[PDB]
Amino acid sequence: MDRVLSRADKERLLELLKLPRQLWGDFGRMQQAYKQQSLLLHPDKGGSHALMQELNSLWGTFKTEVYNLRMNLGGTGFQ
C-alpha cells in the first residue's frame, strides 16, 4: 500500500529524534539521533513498545525516500 507520512508525521519523528527541523536532511545527523533515541526507547532500557514501533515506521518509510534523497541535489525537475 501507499506508505507516506505528512508534515505532522515526519515532524513527529523529529521530536523523538531530538533533532531540530532546521537540519532536517542530513542522513548522518538524523540516523545519529535515531540510534541514540532507539537505544533509550528499547524495552530493556525502560521504554514503551508502541513508541519504538512508531519511530521505526516513521523512519522506515521516511528512509524509503531517504535512499532517493541522495539523488536530489537541486530543485527543478518537471517531467
The CATH number given to whatever domain includes residue 66 is 1.10.287.110
How many structural domains compose the chain? 1
| Rounded Cα–Cα distance for residues 50 and 63 (Å) | 20
For the record, the C-alpha cell of 20 comes out as 531540530
| Rounded Cα–Cα distance for residues 20 and 12 (Å) | 11
> Which DSSP state fits 45?
G
**How far from each other are the two terminal CA atoms of the chain, in whole angstroms?**
24
Question: Which range marks the domain in which residue 28 is found?
Answer: 1-79
Q: Residue 75: how many CB atoms within 10 A of its CB?
A: 5
